[PDB]
Amino acid sequence: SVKSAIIGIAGGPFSGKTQLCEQLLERLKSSAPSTFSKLIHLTSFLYPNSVDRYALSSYDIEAFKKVLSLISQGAEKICLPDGSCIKLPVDQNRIILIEGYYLLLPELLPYYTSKIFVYEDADTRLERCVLQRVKAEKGDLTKVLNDFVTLSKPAYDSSIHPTRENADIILPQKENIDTALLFVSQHLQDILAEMN
Amino acid sequence: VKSAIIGIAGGPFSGKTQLCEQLLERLKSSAPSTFSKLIHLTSFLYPNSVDRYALSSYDIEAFKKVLSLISQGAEKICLPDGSCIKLPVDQNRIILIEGYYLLLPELLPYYTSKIFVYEDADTRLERCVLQRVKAEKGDLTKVLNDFVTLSKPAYDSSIHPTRENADIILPQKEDTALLFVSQHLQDILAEMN
Amino acid sequence: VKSAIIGIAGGPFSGKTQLCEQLLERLKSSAPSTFSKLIHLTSFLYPNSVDRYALSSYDIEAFKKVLSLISQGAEKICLPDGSCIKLPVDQNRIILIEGYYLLLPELLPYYTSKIFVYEDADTRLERCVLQRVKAEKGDLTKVLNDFVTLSKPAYDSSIHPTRENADIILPQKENIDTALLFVSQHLQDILAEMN
Amino acid sequence: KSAIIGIAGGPFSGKTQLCEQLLERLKSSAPSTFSKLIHLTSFLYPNSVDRYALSSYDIEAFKKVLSLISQGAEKICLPDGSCIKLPVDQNRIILIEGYYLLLPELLPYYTSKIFVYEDADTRLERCVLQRVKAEKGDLTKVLNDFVTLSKPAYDSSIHPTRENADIILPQKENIDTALLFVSQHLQDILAEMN
């Protein structure tokens, strides 16, 4: 009865996957308002008091698998290690967008209806990091560079990057990605059309 | 009055050609009222080019002008092949194009969609030997030599860096890319109507 | 009693074993009074491992003990495979070690110097089948399957990201004589400092 | 008699600083041996807004300078106006540094071929630390120069040449380890010269 679609959107640190997911969510609100849609952040599954948000070792992957299964099974309430609880309606079909670094672990692949990897080069990602944290939020340039390079870079190199080819769709990031946005939104509309 | 151009690029032995042949047959079976045609970038090779992989073997400006004419709604286009195609002006047009260098910067603005079929070089070499050696019974050494001495420098220096000009990169698993791109063409056909 | 440890890593079918033997020749002929020997990381595999490429198949902690013992000047060291290595204590010693997982963060402090033999994936597969199919007349299909299904995930997930831990990355090609000479000169610089 | 050392690398990889310190070490340690550092930027086309792109480089002029040093000519002038006098009574060590030294056409002229490798985010970090934190330039303009000009040039034209090097030296934010490696290599070349 209650059908659910899960979209895993992975990517490296500062690849803009959250903004991309908000844009997809706009299309879902306007084109399928009777379908329940929601964005979930993999960071809500960080272990409590984790120091390194980039490292795979900081993520409760089993809790995430349990949440994925509960969504597929038609559950109405899911609670996350965050402390957050999410009401999932049972009088609508559901499409859950999920966003994070480690969505494409082999162990996780069978749970997704669709799999996307937001690909951006390391320098462009560092540029986004600097423009957000230094230019906009007036943080300290050296500390921001060091957080990126000493913490985010080893995590990306060892654990995130090798999962990128597990995606069905790799989205290369640019100044304007409107065409790729409509490819993906049309794909999600096709998913809901078959689901409904 | 409307024409849709779909560029599907990819490395040597990435299967992009068969991908477009299958999409072409699906257009023939499911949308005969729409004009569909597949153009191969090899139609723009220079005469008697020994190296089909190398960028230097391709008349890129001739390809840019054929693309521009298709974008402007031209009714007849002629190729360096010597062949000429009539594109009807009383039908919507959906043009599949396949080749190594479709995603050079100067060509990017003409496409309705830009797709790169991605595989790792060892995967592509495996495909190359399974076709050329196991099926065609070619000499393993000569096939490996063609791949590594001719196709690999071309891909490494001239094809690979264009992959990020695509709107969509399809990592190939050996069916997935075919389903995605056919659904994409259904959406494009509906929007063009 | 001084010891220099050279860690030589690389992917599957990168030719690092052959390169290490070439380095060994130059050590034998150039510094015969220094003890030199090549050790393979494959002697630290767990018994009856089905996947020789996977990191999970390697007793890395035993490898760390052996590195520590070599540095401490030990004379006899036995490996998980059953081998025992006699290292003279009346000579200085240079130990070349060869394998997939040598340049892993935890292991970096033990090496006197660190090399990664780099080769692209397609040329490594070419080496693989030219050895195993053209020379050894194995089955082309099974060889391709072994490379792509077992060697390739191990390399992509665990070997490749360690390559930039090397002091020297050696790009593989038909003629590596210039790079071979560079590395041999480096190793004799190490020996000259040791004496 | 003659040694040509090509040290290539991407934008903001520190190959210039490394080569400068190698040249100064050569001045102190082998003063009887003629040492000179040639910058590929001396072969930029006039009024180049993009110093990174291959198309802004007079490569043919660079190959002719390479051949003239190989043949032992006594002066070669560079497109920027500097001229090099090569003594006929001295051994010579020519350090060369630049993005495109490892184009295939140019490979045979070198005694040694080195690529200073660093990841693109590390090189952007070097660029920003040097030109924003140290030289007090505008962060947005520096980032735009790196990403819109240096990055396409590196990705399409510098990167693919990197495996033409004999030796790739991986580096992080500083250049000390590469400096020691190449310093010892130059000492071995000098010993061979005597």
Among A126, A135, A142, the residue with its CB nearest the CB of D124 is: A126
Closest-CA residue of A relative to B191 is A186
Tokens of C39: 């050790």
Q: Cβ of D156 and B161 within 8 Å?
A: yes
Chain A hits for B103, Cβ within 8 Å: none
Token reading at C191: 């020996």
Chain B residues within 8 A of C144 when measuring between CB atoms: 126, 129-130
The residue behind tokens 């990031």 is A173
The whole-angstrom distance between C156's CA and the closest CA on chain A is 6
**Contact map slice: A 104-123 vs B, CB within 8 A:** 119, 121
Instruction: Show residues of chain A in contact with C56, CB under 8 Å.
Output: none
Q: Are C124 and C17 in contact (CB under 8 A)?
A: no
Chain A contact set for D123 (CB, 8 A): 123
Distances (CA, A) of C6 to B128, C113, C184, D127: 37, 5, 12, 33
Residue B14 C-alpha, separation from nearest chain D C-alpha, in angstroms: 20
Residues in B touching C140 (Cβ below 8 Å) = 129, 133-134, 140
Q: Which residues of A touch D121 (CB under 8 A)?
A: 122-123, 125-126, 148-149, 153
The three-class DSSP label of residue A42 is helix
Contacts of C121 in chain B (CB under 8 A): 120-122
Residue showing tokens 């004799």: C188
Decide if C169 and D113 are in contact by the 8 Å CB cutoff: no
Q: Decide if A158 and C156 are in contact by the 8 Å CB cutoff.
A: no
Other chains touching B, judged by 3 or more CB pairs under 8 Å: A, C, D
Q: Which residues pair with D112 in a beta bridge?
A: D5
Residue D51: phi and psi, rounded to 5, are -80, -10
- β-partners of residue B84 are B78
Q: Which residues contact C3 (CB under 8 A, 6 or more apart)?
A: C70, C71, C73, C87, C92, C93, C94, C95
Comparing CB atoms, the residue among C120, C144, C147 nearest residue B121 is: C120
Q: D92 - beta bridge partners? A: D2, D34
The sign of the dihedral angle between the CA atoms of C55, C56, C59, C64 is positive
Mutant choice from D102, D110, D167, D185 vs C, greatest count of C C-beta within 10 A: D167
Q: Quote the CA–CA distance of B46 and C112 in Å, as a whole number.
A: 54
CA A178, A179, A184, A189 torsion: positive or negative? positive
Q: In whole angstroms, what is the distance from residue B177 CA to residue B158 CA? A: 23
Query: Which of chain A's residues have a Cβ under 8 Å away from the Cβ of C157?
Result: 162
Nearest C-alpha in B relative to A170: B169
Kind plus residue range of the DSSP H or E element containing D36: strand D34-39
What is the gyration radius of the CA atoms in chain B, in angstroms?
17
d(CA C163, CA C177): 21
Helix (H) or strand (E) holding B136: none
Distance (Å, whole) CA C169 – CA C110: 18
Cα separation, A172 vs A11, whole angstroms: 11
CA dist., res. D176 & res. A97, Å (int)? 47
- What is the experimental method? X-ray
> Nearest 5°: phi and psi at D121?
-70, -35
Helix, strand, coil in percent for chain D, rounding step 5 = 50, 20, 30
CA of B164: which chain D residue's CA is closest? Answer: D155
Residue A190 structural domain: 1-196
Using a CB-CB distance cutoff of 8 angstroms, which residues of chain C are in contact with residue D166?
A: 171, 176, 178-179, 182
User: What value, to the nearest 5°, has the Cα angle with vertex A153 and ends B167 and D12?
Assistant: 80
Helices D15-29 and D176-193, axial angle in degrees (round to 10) = 40
Residues 143-182 of B with CB under 8 A from D: 156-157, 160-162, 164
Interface test with B, best of D156, D163, D164 (most B CBs within 10 A): D156
Count of domains for chain A: 1
* Chain A residue with the nearest C-alpha to that of B170: A169
DSSP state letters, A14-31:
TS-HHHHHHHHHHHHHHH
**Closest by Cα among A193, A147, A153, A180 to A23:** A180
DSSP 8-state code for residue A47: P
DSSP string, B144-192: HHIIIIIIHHHIIIIIGGGGGGSSEEEE----HHHHHHHHHHHHHHHHH
What's the length of chain A?
196
Beta strand pairing status for D83-85 and D75-77? antiparallel
The answer to whether the Cα torsion of A181, A186, A191, A193 is positive or negative is: positive
Half-sphere exposure (Cβ direction) of A118: Cα atoms closer than 13 Å = 27
Residue type, C50: V
Pick the residue from chain A with its C-alpha nearest to B183: A187
* DSSP character string of C133-184: IIIT---HHHHHHHIIIIIHHHIIIIIGGGGGG-SEEEE--S--HHHHHHHH
Q: Tokens standing for B184?
A: 């994409």
* Partner residue facing B187 (CB), from A169, A171, A186: A186
Cα–Cα distances (Å) from D63 to C73, C142, D57, D76, D96, in that order, read: 52, 48, 11, 12, 12
Burial class of D8 by CB neighbour count within 10 A (0 to 12, 13 to 18, 19+):
buried
> Which residues of chain D neighbour B157 with C-beta distances below 8 Å?
160
C-beta pairs of A30-34 under 8 Å, 24+ apart in sequence: A31/A185, A31/A189, A32/A95, A32/A189, A32/A192, A34/A92
Inter-chain touch C169–D166, beta carbons under 8 Å? no
Which chain A residues are within 8 Å of C104, Cβ to Cβ? none
Q: Is C66 on the interface with D (CB under 8 A)?
A: no
Residue B153 C-alpha, separation from nearest chain D C-alpha, in angstroms: 9
Residues A94 and A88: their CA atoms lie apart, in Å, by 8
The chains in contact with chain A, meaning 3 or more Cβ pairs closer than 8 Å, are B, C, D
Number of Cβ pairs < 8 A linking chain A and chain D: 49
Q: How far is B137 from chain D (nearest CA, A)?
A: 33
- Three-class secondary structure of residue D3 per DSSP: strand
Token output for C114: 């660190």
Cβ-based neighbours of D24, under 8 Å, separated by 6 or more? none
Tokens of A40: 């979930």
Count Cβ–Cβ pairs < 8 Å, chain B vs chain C: 47
Suggest the residue from A7, A119, A169 to mutate for an interface test with chain B (most B CBs closer than 10 A): A169
Question: Which of B13, B12, B16, B4 has the alpha carbon at shortest distance from B116?
Answer: B16
Q: Which residue of D has its CA nearest to A140?
A: D133
Per the listing, tokens 């969505």 go with A103
CA distance B61 to chain A (A): 25
